[PDB]
Automatic annotation (TrEMBL):
Pfam families: MTHFR_2. This is Uncharacterized protein. InterPro entries: MTHFR (IPR049477). Gene3D superfamilies: 3.20.20.220.
């Protein structure tokens, strides 16, 4: 059981003369600063470093290269004493021996959990679900991605638990759909993976860029339609009003799943960047319930 507060920390752009090293150091320090200014010093137990970033084909300016998960971790680990590592890992370009070597490298560096994921839309090894069960003593927390609104997620997530998933890291949660999912999942199955509950701060910039709106989109799915409308509302609200709405949602989710039998961790995300306003919302969420 992780039983932790994980912060999403995206590696910096490596296109510059220094490869993003100084940017990585300022990122780690800004995380500690925001936590300190909001009353959450020492509360974060893990950083969640994504090894894959969804690419939107319709973004005009292509995404600059990013640091490797492990290169990024090597720089920020001295800056984040006591905090452990989580990550996502693309497995499509790793055969079983190469997967063994990567798992060993991550395990040695101090990663507790790893979620295997696929490649972006615009991109061309072991399948993520087949990797869950391989070399299970290395990075023993093996994660699957859970999207409770997705069609057929019940049988999909159930099969991933069969195949060795020990925790589920959810897509960003902007409704209480996770409550109905886990209730039905606990009714149908004995599987009780730890659920890493993902909550993402929404700033006013979402109203212009629409990044989060795109990340969660699911055309035709009315449940996601409701969530996108919730995100669009949040983005236009004044800072205090949106903090209350996200905290209320947080309470509905925690209160909805608290008696279902799944171990709970919390996954904090700030899609547009770590900020003090983001951590002001995080703090009030964790003040209601915290792992």
């Amino acid at each position: 059981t992780l039983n932790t507060i994980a912060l999403e920390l995206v590696p910096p752009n490596s296109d510059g003369p220094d490869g993003g090293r100084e940017q990585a150091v300022e990122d780690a320090r800004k995380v500690l600063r925001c936590a300190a200014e909001t009353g959450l010093a020492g509360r974060i137990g893990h950083v969640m470093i994504p090894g894959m970033i969804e690419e939107d084909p319709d973004r005009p300016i292509p995404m600059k290269p990013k640091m490797d998960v492990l290169d990024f971790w090597t720089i920020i680990r001295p800056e984040l004493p006591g905090i452990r590592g989580l990550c996502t890992q693309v497995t499509a370009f790793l055969d079983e021996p190469a997967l063994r070597r990567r798992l060993g490298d991550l395990s040695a560096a101090g990663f507790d959990g790893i979620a295997f994921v696929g490649v972006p839309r615009t991109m061309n090894g072991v399948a993520p679900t087949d990797a869950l069960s391989m070399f299970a003593d290395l990075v023993p927390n093996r994660g699957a991605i859970l999207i409770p609104t997705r069609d057929g997620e019940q049988g999909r997530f159930e099969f991933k638990c069969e195949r060795g998933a020990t925790y589920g890291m959810t897509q960003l949660l902007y409704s209480d759909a996770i409550v109905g999912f886990l209730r039905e999942f606990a009714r149908r199955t004995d599987h009780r993976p730890e659920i890493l509950l993902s909550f993402g701060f929404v700033p006013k910039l979402e109203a212009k860029v629409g990044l989060i709106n795109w990340l969660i989109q699911d055309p035709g799915n009315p449940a996601v339609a409701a969530e996108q409308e919730f995100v669009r509302r949040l983005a236009g609200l004044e800072p205090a009003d949106k903090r209350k709405l996200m905290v209320d949602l947080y309470k509905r989710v925690i209160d909805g799943v608290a008696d279902l039998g799944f171990p709970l961790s919390v996954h904090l995300e700030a899609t547009y960047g770590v900020s003090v306003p983001a951590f002001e919302t995080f703090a009030e969420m964790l003040a209601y319930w915290s792992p």
